[PDB]
Amino acid sequence: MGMNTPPELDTVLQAPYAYNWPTSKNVKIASRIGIPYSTFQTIQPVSDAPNNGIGQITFNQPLGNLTGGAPRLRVSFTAEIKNILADSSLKDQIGLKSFPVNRSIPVAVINMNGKTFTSYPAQLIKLHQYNADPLELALLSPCSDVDEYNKIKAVSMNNPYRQGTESTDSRMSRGLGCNYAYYIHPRAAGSTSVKIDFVVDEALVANPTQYKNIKDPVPFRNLNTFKVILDGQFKPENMIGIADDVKLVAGKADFEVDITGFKINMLVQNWVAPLEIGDIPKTIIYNTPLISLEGNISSMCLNTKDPYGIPGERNKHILTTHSMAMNNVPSMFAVMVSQETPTKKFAPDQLAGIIGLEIKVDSDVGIFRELEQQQLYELSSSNGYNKRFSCFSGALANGLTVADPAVAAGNKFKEAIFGAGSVIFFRPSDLGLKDYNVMANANKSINMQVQATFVTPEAAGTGAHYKLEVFSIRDNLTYSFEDGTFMDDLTLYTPDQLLRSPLKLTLMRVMGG
Amino acid sequence: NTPPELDTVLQAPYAYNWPTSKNVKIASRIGIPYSTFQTIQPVSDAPNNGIGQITFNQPLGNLTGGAPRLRVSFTAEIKNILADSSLKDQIGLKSFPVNRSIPVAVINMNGKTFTSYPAQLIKLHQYNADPLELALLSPCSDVDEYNKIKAVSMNNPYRQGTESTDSRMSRGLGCNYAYYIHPRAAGSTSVKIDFVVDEALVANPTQYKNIKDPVPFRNLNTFKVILDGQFKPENMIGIADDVKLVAGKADFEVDITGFKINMLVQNWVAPLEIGDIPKTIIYNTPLISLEGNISSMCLNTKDPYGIPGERNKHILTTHSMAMNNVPSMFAVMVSQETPTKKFAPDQLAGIIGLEIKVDSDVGIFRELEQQQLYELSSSNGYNKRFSCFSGALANGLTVADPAVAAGNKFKEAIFGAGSVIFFRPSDLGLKDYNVMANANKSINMQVQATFVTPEAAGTGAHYKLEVFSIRDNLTYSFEDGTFMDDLTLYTPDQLLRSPLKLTKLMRVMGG
Amino acid sequence: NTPPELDTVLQAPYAYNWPTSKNVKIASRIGIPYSTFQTIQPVSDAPNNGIGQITFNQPLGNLTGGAPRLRVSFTAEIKNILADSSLKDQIGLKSFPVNRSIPVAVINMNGKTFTSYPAQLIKLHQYNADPLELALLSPCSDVDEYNKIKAVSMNNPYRQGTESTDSRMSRGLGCNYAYYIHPRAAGSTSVKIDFVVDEALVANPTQYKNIKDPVPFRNLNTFKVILDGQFKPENMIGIADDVKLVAGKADFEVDITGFKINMLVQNWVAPLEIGDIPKTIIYNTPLISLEGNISSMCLNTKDPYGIPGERNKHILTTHSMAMNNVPSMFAVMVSQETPTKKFAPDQLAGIIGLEIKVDSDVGIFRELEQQQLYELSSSNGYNKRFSCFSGALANGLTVADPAVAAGNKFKEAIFGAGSVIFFRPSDLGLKDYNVMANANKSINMQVQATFVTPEAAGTGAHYKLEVFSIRDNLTYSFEDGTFMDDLTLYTPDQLLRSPLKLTKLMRVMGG
């Protein structure tokens, strides 16, 4: 159009940091203070642990001065696995499920100085495993690898039950002899069972623990009342993994597994604040996100076409939540469609493959209707989703095996493997709402409805119940006052305050988002 | 002399930076939405077999994503497969199959055309980009290390998802991209596979180096993307070298049908909170050019799998290459001109020596051997292992086996894929201090490469020495609608007096 | 109590930090050249079998690279291999084979000598360095997790390149280093392999912790590198534990011939644009020393592959170790004194308890169990999996198999390689607050380690407890030519009143 010339730009010479010569003008020498490993507490529960891992477990241990921000639970037990075909090698076929400690705790209550925090570790970790940093996840649990597909076989190389000697990268393995202590009892000739001792030391994922910052969590102060109350569900379906190609004794449909000798301790650092940090501030703030199930709905999903057939012909099931009333705007949402009832106890968890999503917020309807599955994967990945597309999609993963004419039509289904399925993370900012007041942390009431279209792995002429769940992740802070009091509260502001807040495009801490 | 006094600090964990009202702020958020995400159809029906011009013509208001993608879908039928072949872990796609299929692209923004060469760009870019970025660019981001792929071997990019612990290593089925294998009949010698690939377009001015968070384009009243579509099997389809052929057939025959292509890009209205957008927005849009090439028929007289020091040492030297200004980086590779198989890894020669002339300064790098040339290239981002770069014999035991008769040693030999050597003007240590990246000084360059090739004793083939320049180049978006692009050029004196950058809203481009 | 008011911000993508003339600058570049790269020959012909003193003596003008490397080449002949052995994925090199081969090194810069112990240094450093830096240090950077390597198992560093998806995992052929296997005759029981390895020298004052971008040395009128060369098979050559032996032979017999060694380092003139080089340049050059050791004959009476709680718990306690100042870090290791096989992984014991005494403070860490000791070591950089650290039985199914006779259970058992525990004085939580890293305060320390060993019931072997110190230590280059080095020591009172550092041209050394 007009007269345009590129603007003048100033120049610099990019040079290696090696030429920033170290001298007396730019070098200082450090000594060090740090969190010690002396007086590291091993805390027994108030009563002898339930011998099979099932029941309430309470830790009650006042602790003076500073306490580690990411306390851990150390569990030990013996698992007896029965109904194994005689003469089975079991090589690379036995291990633990992902995050077996937190999977085993449906609800936890933590009391600090009379303030109780109720959370749901099994629900929390099922989401968290999919969009956290995998480096933090390995600090959280020795069993941090997340299943990509709905079956695991020792014949396949992507096998989390490969033992340590079969694993080049330890983070890939939930198997024996790799990240956790174990002992296999001697097996008799002709035996159809095995006993394995396990020990697992895993960070507790329960508000207000600092499970997102395991290397360097902010300590707690002066826990004069400190109780950790667990709904203990340390049972085989929560903890134990068995490859889908282990053969069964004639006449048995699944393995029978028993837990005995269950023990549990809470392990946490405890220490006196060093002289050099001076006065600890009166009021300490902790980032303690609040994860909530906002809505759910289920249906019986019947397939009439082969799930291993042409992908575009797989039955497209739809579920839509009831309207979900919220008093404020969360930071993030997560959508997943879960198989309600596992058909096997020791196999990967099954989710549906979500192929479409439509969101209504207030009067704004049909949001994301133009997205297909690859774009939904991109959306979720933009918010941290950390697994491959073939997992997310729920597609048929082993098509050659199923396209084989030597596999009779009847056995094609039995041999088919699918992606584990979808979790879709989205923020209110992803929705492009015309209502600019709907911002994360706004104290504005909203109504949301979620429609998910999805595919399921059941055979043609069969079905199963699936549940659409919509979770919120809210920014939430815990406050430690100098007199001992703890409080927690959502970080809420008016839309007008947020609209006028300065942009952040890149010792100050910024929490929330 | 006495050591100087140094001040002391106490290193302490960040845990002791206690969060309080003095040092904590709470964020809300704005971001780029996934609503009104555009799926743009071409102006006319795509060629059924992927061959032909393809045009997108779609004005877009307000803000448009900086890294638009192409979603391709098609069926490939692979014929001449020995009956009763399992095909397990043997079929997939070549690296960056969408960009490999586009020899030339023209993008028009508001009347300004940008012509680039995606296939040429990605062949180079794949070797020194950040592998994390490459995985965001394409689902098929693993780059071959060796000149043959076999399902009997564990380094196999056609291992399917259930055989791959790390998805980034696989270009196979059931891992990073959607696929469907049609049922196979007893005794069949062919397979049909549906594929879908969503890959970022690598064509100026797209922001393919910043896929997570690219700077958007604005007010695209004219937006055209014109592709030379060459979505043919040799550009897209990979077949392991140990799949067996039907008797009498020299190679597989592959046909593409059902080809469809859409351009996918975000589009949205600027949030109220960012206020006015600046009058002139600047985009980093590097310009990659072939500066010179030369070829020869290279004949081997000694076994390429024999003593490495006895491998024939071929030499190619470019003609003098006249440049009007000094590029930021150069890349040297020696390519096998004619593939002997259509669905196998690309073959480069193993470069064992390099000598550079710039103006009157001759023989630069003559004292470097192959390990040092690997170190040089790696210091400029080269991202593969030494046994790839070197082009050396990779499976020495197999060839040393006395049960493998002399005639079959050649057929069984596997070599590194070969070399790409990235170097900057600053790597040359030129006595002429005026020869600096982005200087508006004319120079003349000649490149000599000494290299080894994988052909059998008593055979040969044509190899081409290519020297590429990578120049710092910027695109300017003026608020009146105009787009321009230009090299970033300065006098040597300007550059010689510029301040050093030895290490947050400030952006530094070029280098 | 009421929660405090907190200010708010809007988190926004960096894409909205629009690049404009107000926030963009354009870089040219200067860098460290690859021209005049020195390949320095030893003053006398290298010892043909790799055993003997080796000296490099080469004055260098201007700037010299801070991380010089050694390029070794040799042929290894391996004898006593069962006839018709494939050897597939069974031969390679041990971790850091060059530094493993140098028990002591002396470097002279302008008349100042620095004496260090590379083999001792690398045995520690491999366990808590950044693995990305370790791969720049040596092509053979993977560290053994278990005490046996078998080609039947996937965690096998002698996997060749074509069997390795990730090159950093492999110390095998055809992956990270050049090699050539000589043709093998029918019925032969030996193999000859040529190797070439280019590895950074780990010897004070080399900048081996910063290989990508080390600070250069300047104006070396005297530059000598004097090595105790022990480039012998037990230091360099790895052979999988499932390679079979010819009848009547107990171990392989390996010979090194044709040994050559050169020192490779960049050398260049300072660019005009950095102006004057400072009068005194400081280099971080940590001092690693053995502070104490003690040994015993450790006899096992229970099966090491039996119930873990019943494995014999061996205890070693050092004598009192007197130190004149407080080191930054300690490392505790219990080593098998005498290898039973020459080409197998190094064996350490599994440490299950540790108790530390410092001055009058006794029994520190007595409440920690093995998992907590692993966490402690990991907090200070320990970089391997728990099953390595623990020294536990790694292959319990094999041992639990009733088809494996009680007599063969031991032979088939595989254990973790065993423990290294890194700890800092700050980890000890001492009531004496004067005991701080770099304090010029005398202390006395005693270390007790409780550990398990892999020997069969009814047998034993000697184990040595070693406690190493890592001290913060600086080298100073004065422009008159003089070099000095010295510990960085301060009074406790100086350190106690020093400002906290809780979190770019400023450099902080030590810690």
The structural domain count of chain C equals: 1
Q: Mapping DSSP to helix (H, G, I), strand (E, B) and coil, where does residue B56 land? A: strand
List chain A residues with CB under 8 Å of C153: 165-166
Measured between CB atoms, does C501 come within 8 Å of chain B? yes
Q: Mapping DSSP to helix (H, G, I), strand (E, B) and coil, where does residue B184 land? A: coil
Contact B446, B293 (CB under 8 A): no
Q: Which residues contact A289 (CB under 8 A, 6 or more apart)?
A: A207, A473, A474, A475, A476
- CA dist A469 and B114 (Å) reads 47
- CA dist B384 and B373 (Å) reads 13
- Detail the DSSP E strand segments found in B166-286: 178-181, 190-200, 217-220, 223-230, 237-239, 253-268, 280-284
Alpha-carbon distance B206 to nearest alpha carbon in chain C (angstroms):
14
| Interface contact B500-C274, CB threshold 8 A | yes
Measured between CB atoms, does A152 come within 8 Å of chain B? no
Element (H, E) at A413: helix A409-415
Chains that touch B (3 or more CB pairs under 8 A): A, C
- CA distance readout (Å), C411 to C406, C416, C454: 10, 15, 11
Q: Which contacts (CB < 8 Å, 24+ apart) does range A458-461 have? A: A458/A301, A458/A302, A458/A303, A458/A307, A459/A303, A459/A306, A459/A307, A459/A413, A460/A303, A460/A304, A460/A305, A460/A306, A460/A307, A461/A303, A461/A304
Contact B214, B32 (CB under 8 A): no
Q: Furthest-apart CA pair in chain A: how many Å?
A: 91
C219: burial class by Cβ within 10 Å (0-12, 13-18, 19+)? middle
Q: How many CB atoms lie within 10 A of CB A103?
A: 25
Q: Which of B280, B490, B496 sits opposite C21 (nearest CB)?
A: B280
- CA dist A153 and C200 (Å) reads 43
- CA torsion sign for A497, A503, A509, A512 is positive
H helix runs in A9-156, sequence order: 100-103, 121-128, 134-140
Q: Which residue has the tokens 């994925």?
A: C89
Contact B195, B74 (CB under 8 A): yes
**Cross-strand pairs, C295:** C464
- CA dist B9 and C430 (Å) reads 20
Question: Cα C310 vs. chain centroid, distance in angstroms?
Answer: 32
Alpha-carbon distance C277 to nearest alpha carbon in chain B (angstroms):
14
Alpha-carbon distance C507 to nearest alpha carbon in chain A (angstroms):
5
Q: Which residue has the tokens 């390429």?
A: B304
Contact B354, B448 (CB under 8 A): yes
**CA atoms within 13 Å, Cβ hemisphere of C152:** 6
Q: Which residues contact A66 (CB under 8 A, 6 or more apart)?
A: A219, A220, A221, A269, A270, A271, A272, A273
Q: Mapping DSSP to helix (H, G, I), strand (E, B) and coil, where does residue B439 land? A: strand
Q: Mapping DSSP to helix (H, G, I), strand (E, B) and coil, where does residue A121 land? A: helix
Spell out a b/e string for A347-375, using b for 16 or more CB atoms within 10 Å of the CB, else e. bbbbbbbbbbbbbbbeebeebbeebebbb
List chain A residues with CB under 8 Å of B268: 432
Q: Which residue has the tokens 């600890």?
A: A280
List chain A residues with CB under 8 Å of B264: 375
| Interface contact C88-B397, CB threshold 8 A | yes
Q: Mapping DSSP to helix (H, G, I), strand (E, B) and coil, where does residue B39 land? A: strand
Find residues 288-307 of chain A whose CB sits inside 8 Å of chain B.
Answer: none
Measured between CB atoms, does C19 come within 8 Å of chain A? no
The tokens describing C171, both together, are: 């110390």
Q: Domain range for residue A390? A: 1-513
Q: Furthest-apart CA pair in chain C: how many Å?
A: 87
Contact A481, A487 (CB under 8 A): yes
- CA dist C140 and C126 (Å) reads 11
- CA distance readout (Å), A247 to C113, C193, C497: 67, 45, 67
- CA distance readout (Å), A20 to C142, C214, C393: 32, 11, 49
Measured between CB atoms, does A511 come within 8 Å of chain B? yes
Q: Which residue of C has its CA nearest to B309?
A: C180
Q: Which residue has the tokens 């990073």?
A: B176
Find residues 202-221 of chain B whose CB sits inside 8 Å of chain A.
Answer: 212
Residue of B485, B489, B475, B476 whose CA lies nearest to B437: B489
**Cross-strand pairs, A149:** A419
Measured between CB atoms, does A5 come within 8 Å of chain C? no
- CA dist B371 and C196 (Å) reads 10
- CA dist A407 and A417 (Å) reads 14
Contact A487, A288 (CB under 8 A): no
Element (H, E) at C219: strand C217-220
| Interface contact B385-C88, CB threshold 8 A | no
**Cross-strand pairs, C393:** C415
What DSSP string describes C130-162?
-HHHHHHH-S-----SBS---TTSSS-TT--GG
Q: Mapping DSSP to helix (H, G, I), strand (E, B) and coil, where does residue A128 land? A: helix
The amino acid at A84: I
Measured between CB atoms, does C496 come within 8 Å of chain A? yes
Chains that touch C (3 or more CB pairs under 8 A): A, B
- CA distance readout (Å), C16 to A406, B285, B286, C11, C13: 57, 18, 21, 11, 6
| Interface contact A396-B185, CB threshold 8 A | no
The tokens describing C405, both together, are: 């006779």
Spell out a b/e string for B52-88, using b for 16 or more CB atoms within 10 Å of the CB, else e. eebebebebeebbbbbbbbbbbbebebebbeeebebb
- CA dist C474 and B2 (Å) reads 13
- CA dist A392 and B177 (Å) reads 11
Q: Which residue of C has its CA nearest to A479?
A: C3
Residue of C268, C197, C202 whose CA lies nearest to C67: C202
- CA dist C423 and C373 (Å) reads 9
Rama region for C219: left / alpha / beta (φ>0; ψ in -120 to 50; rest): left
Number of H helices and number of E strands within chain C?
Answer: 9, 30
| Interface contact C29-B392, CB threshold 8 A | no
| Interface contact C393-A177, CB threshold 8 A | yes
- CA dist C32 and C268 (Å) reads 8
Model resolution, angstroms? 1.5
Measured between CB atoms, does A498 come within 8 Å of chain C? yes
| Interface contact C178-B490, CB threshold 8 A | no
List chain C residues with CB under 8 Å of A277: 500
Indicate the pairing of strand A446-455 with strand A324-326: antiparallel
- CA dist A277 and A34 (Å) reads 11
Measured between CB atoms, does C487 come within 8 Å of chain A? no
- Detail the DSSP E strand segments found in A251-320: 256-271, 284-287, 290-303, 317-320
What DSSP string describes C320-357?
PEEESS--SEEEEEEEESS-SSSSSPP-B-EEEEEEEE
Phi and psi at residue C119, in whole multiples of 5°?
-65, -40
Contact C442, C324 (CB under 8 A): yes
Residue of C342, C122, C149, B135 whose CA lies nearest to A168: C149
Angle at B174 between CA B172 and CA B176, to 5 degrees: 70
Q: Choosing among A8, A31, A187, which should be mutated to test the C contact, i.e. which has the most C CBs within 10 A?
A: A31
Measured between CB atoms, does B152 come within 8 Å of chain A? no
Q: Choosing among C5, C17, C26, which should be mutated to test the B contact, i.e. which has the most B CBs within 10 A?
A: C26
Q: Mapping DSSP to helix (H, G, I), strand (E, B) and coil, where does residue B427 land? A: helix
| Interface contact B10-A31, CB threshold 8 A | yes
Q: Which of A15, A400, A429 sits opposite B502 (nearest CB)?
A: A15
Number of H helices and number of E strands within chain B?
Answer: 9, 29
- CA distance readout (Å), B363 to B314, B421, B423, C7: 17, 16, 15, 63
What DSSP string describes C220-242?
ESSEEEEEEEE--HHHHEEE-TT
Q: Mapping DSSP to helix (H, G, I), strand (E, B) and coil, where does residue A491 land? A: coil
* Torsion, Cα of B258, B263, B266, B270 (10° steps): -150
The amino acid at C232: K
Q: Which residue has the tokens 């068995």?
A: A242
Peptide bond into B205 cis (omega under 30): yes
Q: Mapping DSSP to helix (H, G, I), strand (E, B) and coil, where does residue A229 land? A: strand
What DSSP string describes B81-108?
BPTT---TT-EEE-SSHHHHT-S-EEEE
Chains that touch A (3 or more CB pairs under 8 A): B, C
List chain A residues with CB under 8 Å of C3: 477, 479, 487, 489
Find residues 383-442 of chain B whose CB sits inside 8 Å of chain A.
Answer: 438
Phi and psi at residue B312, in whole multiples of 5°?
-60, 130
List chain A residues with CB under 8 Å of C367: 39-40, 42
List chain A residues with CB under 8 Å of C214: 18
Q: How many CB atoms lie within 10 A of CB B115?
A: 11
Element (H, E) at C79: strand C69-79
- CA dist B354 and C462 (Å) reads 54
Q: Which residues contact B486 (CB under 8 A, 6 or more apart)?
A: A6, B473, B474, B476
H helix runs in A107-223, sequence order: 121-128, 134-140
**Cross-strand pairs, C283:** C475
Indicate the pairing of strand A476-480 with strand A446-455: unpaired
Contact C126, C143 (CB under 8 A): yes
Q: What is the 3-state secondary structure (H, E, C) of B214-226?
A: CCCEEEECCEEEE
Residue of C432, C293, C451, C422 whose CA lies nearest to C362: C432
| Interface contact B506-C23, CB threshold 8 A | yes
Phi and psi at residue B470, in whole multiples of 5°?
-120, 110
Count of A-C CB contacts under 8 Å: 278
Peptide bond into C205 cis (omega under 30): yes
Q: Which of C14, C167, C508 sits opposite B9 (nearest CB)?
A: C508
Angle at B90 between CA B89 and CA B91, to 5 degrees: 110
**Cross-strand pairs, C350:** C452
**CA atoms within 13 Å, Cβ hemisphere of A440:** 28
- CA dist A311 and A399 (Å) reads 11
Q: Which residue of B has its CA nearest to A389?
A: B176
Q: Which residue of B has its CA nearest to A359?
A: B35
The tokens describing C2, both together, are: 């009421």
- CA distance readout (Å), C484 to B505, C64, C282: 42, 18, 10
